[PDB]
Structure 1
């Protein structure tokens, strides 16, 4: 749903690069591979972690909250 905190294979921290990856794709008009390389993800285990992630939390946030406060 949300970006994983750690890479499954090796344990590198990748949960702090989702916003940077999206910003590189949108504002900088960079390709996915170039953005992944620029973010410091060298091993394809982390490259797939960030490349194949699907952000379903954005869709889940479209529903009105069940409980208010």
Structure 2
């Protein structure tokens, strides 16, 4: 639904790299370069953003 606040396996906080991730992808950067530029070194954190599906943007479209 919404970005997890902390990576599950480790606990590293990834809940503040969602908008930065989206901004570096709009600038032309690959998902690899983008996840690198955010400080997500170990692949347990990289999967936390790489495979996130933001469904809070589709629920926030039905009437109040």
Normalising by structure 2, what TM-score?
A: 0.98
Q: CA deviation at 1:8?
A: 0.2
For residues 1-69 of structure 1, the aligned pairs below 5 Å read: 1-26=1-26, 28-65=27-64
Q: CA deviation at 1:22?
A: 0.3
Whole-angstrom distance in 2 between the partners of 1:15 and 1:51? 13
Number of matched pairs: 64
Whole-angstrom distance in 2 between the partners of 1:3 and 1:31? 20
Structure 2 gap segments, 5+ residues each: none
Structure 1 gap segments, 5+ residues each: none
Whole-angstrom distance in 2 between the partners of 1:34 and 1:46? 14
Q: CA deviation at 1:16?
A: 0.2
Runs of 4+ in 1 over 2 A off after TM superposition: none
Q: Rg larger in 1 or in 2?
A: 1
Q: CA deviation at 1:57?
A: 0.2
